[PDB]
């Protein structure tokens, strides 16, 4: 269907061209037309504030405030959320949790909490709150309406928190502080030039949310007659102001809700703008009581370009050396961000014991961390062919360990046959060191012919191998996080159609230049290039352009300094046993496992280098790799399992229930199982003082 208006704006044509759904293209055109006629955005807004500009703990309160916490959460880190919920809980407060529509695993875990406590509820509606999306404001405004209509919850303050927040002061001080200033609103402004704030936020640009993407559609004017302000979208607002925002029909609230429906990052300026221009303008404190770990040197890399038509930034994760910052006395602060348990748990532990004391001696699991990365109810189609293939292989690696660990000349009662697909997968950390994967899976014990449920721990073999140079480590992976300087593909799981990235980590010293060589499993040199390591460099990384598919097997990456060897590392390109979650067929196996289409991985060749580096190409191994490329079924499974076993180790395996294998422990009795005690994240009965911690 053609538009109702001629569409000539460059941004809008670029948006229509990139959009994927018919509904989305229609919505884009409708929005553009309405703004074109001047019927979409307000041009002048009434200001009700009489002021000329802006306004700007060890006692026991007689009338303590009751707080409504609004948690907007996403991801997989359910156990870290449980630890934080434990720290902030008191029977007198209220907890309203909105879980991103895309995080069904997390939503199932949150549901178990809301069922235990009468002052904890979950939002029945769920939005896909993408970064910078307009829907974050819709989330807050709807939860405020819900909360104001819950008459059985007489709350006085509104506080929003994410799963990466944590308190840095006790609940008793929070209540005492807010009880003294109960008629104030806590918002932090940008603290710079206002014109530059507007440009950098894109407030003079029109955005539209559709298909989980923020489309930029053109320019717009800032309405006349009001002061525009903004800053952090983390705040604390009292009930009187929430009532005004929710139910007022005056000129200010009505037009601002329309304006901010088509705004990028709306929660960073909507509440600042309304308050300063409203009758409540004299209640504003220019302080949101937060510590945000900004390090714009690392957090501004336009890393959201695939989600929004704009460049964004985000704060860094705290580390142990930052602990002293939580003890400052310059201004009152009660929360901080960000924390990530898979990035650094020590600082979280330091902070929790400092506020609420050590755990009893002998408490297990304090230095460990478990994070679920697959749960059966979400289905194998939510996995990829890569992870499905390798999780199956890890399970088989564990079953072979069990058989070999029993020493007998009679019937081996530790022989198993695998059944179905993995039930769950966990990341396992100990002392902030990644330990590998935990796979829960079903298998038949062949001696008694009975089904058993087991969990297997697999750990990657060390492969980095290192004249006092600067190099400290080298690694290959995918999904490199430039802000946190790590691979988010923790296991380094790779398939033939993946595009690996090589990373190096350097210490201090003078500038140096090094050479990098990539070698495939049959000694073909795929790429060579030199890098400059400046004096101030700490990390370097590069993604070489390799034609796909990559030949399966064990690759090697070498670093040289003027032909002088420095170090090497290895990584695994695993052959796939699945296609569309189905057993791979001969014709699709051959297309995928015989190296890239063009006999060569890049344009320039490096055959001139094989003799120099002592990488001779064995004609027998080349033909065997071709033969391997046509195998399926059992032959292919044996090739994969021989590869995985050479790069991974089955550390241990346990049973969840009764077992006939006499040498396997119960999982709950182990130190490493996701079934073992983890009291720091476990939630029990409310104590006499109203706390869970």
């Amino acid at each position: 269907q053609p538009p109702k208006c001629d569409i000539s704006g460059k941004e809008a044509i670029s948006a229509l061209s990139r959009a994927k759904s018919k509904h989305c293209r229609q919505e884009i055109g409708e929005t553009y037309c309405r703004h074109k006629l001047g019927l979409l955005m307000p041009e002048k807004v009434t200001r009700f504030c009489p002021l000329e500009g802006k306004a700007n703990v060890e006692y026991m309160p007689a009338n303590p405030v009751r707080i409504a916490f609004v948690l907007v959460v996403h991801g997989r880190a359910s156990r870290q959320l449980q630890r934080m919920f434990k720290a902030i809980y008191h029977k007198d407060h209220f907890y309203y949790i909105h879980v991103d529509k895309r995080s069904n695993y997390l939503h199932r875990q949150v549901l178990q909490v809301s069922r235990q406590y009468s002052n904890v509820r979950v939002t029945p509606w769920r939005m896909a709150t993408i970064w910078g999306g307009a829907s974050l404001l819709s989330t807050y405004l709807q939860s405020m309406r819900d909360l104001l209509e819950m008459t059985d919850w007489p709350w006085d303050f509104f506080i929003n928190l994410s799963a990466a927040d944590y308190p840095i002061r006790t609940n008793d001080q929070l209540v005492a502080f807010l009880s003294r200033y109960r008629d104030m609103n806590f918002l932090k402004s940008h603290g710079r030039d206002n014109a530059r704030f507007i440009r950098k936020q894109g407030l003079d640009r029109l955005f539209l949310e559709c298909d989980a993407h923020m489309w930029r559609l053109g320019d717009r004017r800032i309405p006349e007659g009001i002061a525009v302000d903004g800053g952090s979208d983390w705040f604390l607002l009292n009930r009187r102001f929430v009532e005004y925002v929710t139910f007022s029909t005056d000129d200010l609230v009505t037009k601002m809700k329309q304006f901010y429906s088509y705004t990028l990052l709306p929660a960073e300026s909507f509440f600042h703008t309304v308050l300063e221009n409203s009758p409540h303008c004299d209640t504003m404190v220019d302080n949101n009581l937060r510590i945000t770990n900004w390090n714009r040197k690392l957090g501004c890399k336009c890393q959201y370009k695939h989600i929004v038509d704009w460049c964004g930034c985000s704060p860094n994760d705290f580390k142990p050396q930052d602990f002293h910052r939580f003890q400052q006395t310059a201004r009152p602060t009660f929360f901080a961000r960000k924390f990530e348990a898979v990035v650094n748990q020590e600082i979280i532990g330091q902070l929790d014991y400092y506020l609420y004391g050590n755990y009893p001696a002998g408490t297990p699991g304090l230095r460990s961390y478990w994070e679920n990365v697959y749960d059966e109810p979400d289905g194998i189609h939510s996995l990829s062919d890569v992870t499905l293939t390798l999780y199956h292989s890890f399970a088989r690696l564990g079953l072979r360990r069990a058989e070999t660990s029993l020493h007998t000349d009679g019937e081996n009662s530790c022989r198993y046959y695998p059944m179905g697909h993995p039930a769950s997968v966990h990341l396992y950390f100990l002392a902030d060191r990644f330990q590998g994967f935990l796979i829960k899976h079903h298998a038949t014990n062949l001696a008694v012919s009975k089904l058993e449920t087991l969990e297997t721990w697999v750990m990657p073999k060390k492969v980095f191998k290192i004249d006092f140079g600067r190099l400290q480590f080298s690694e290959v992976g995918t999904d490199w996080d430039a802000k946190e300087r790590l691979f988010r593909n923790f296991g380094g799981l790779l398939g033939p159609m993946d595009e690996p990235v090589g990373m190096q980590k350097w210490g201090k010293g003078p500038n140096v230049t090094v050479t990098v060589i990539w070698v495939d499993p049959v000694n073909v040199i795929a790429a060579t290039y030199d890098i400059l390591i400046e004096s101030t460099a700490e990390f370097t990384h590069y993604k070489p352009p390799l034609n796909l598919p990559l030949r399966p097997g064990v690759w090697t990456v070498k670093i040289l300094h003027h032909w002088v060897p420095v170090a090497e590392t290895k990584f695994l390109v695993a052959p796939l046993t699945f296609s569309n979650r189905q057993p791979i067929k001969p014709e699709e196996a051959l297309k995928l496992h015989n190296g890239p289409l063009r006999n060569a991985y890049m344009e320039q060749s490096f055959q001139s280098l094989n003799p120099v580096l002592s990488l001779p190409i064995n004609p027998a191994q080349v033909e065997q790799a071709r033969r391997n490329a046509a195998s399926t079924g059992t032959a292919l499974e044996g090739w994969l399992d021989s590869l995985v076993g050479g790069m991974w180790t089955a550390m241990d395996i346990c049973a969840t229930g009764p077992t006939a294998c006499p040498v396997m422990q119960t999982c709950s009795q182990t130190a490493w199982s996701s079934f073992s005690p983890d009291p720091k994240s476990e939630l029990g009965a409310v104590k006499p003082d109203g706390r869970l911690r």
């Binding site: 940008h190 704030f197 936020q201 800053g231 510590i291 336009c302």
Partner: peptide, 9 residues
């Protein structure tokens, strides 16, 4: 700590 999450265009 300056505030605001927007970058540029």
């Amino acid at each position: 700590e300056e505030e605001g999450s927007g970058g540029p265009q």
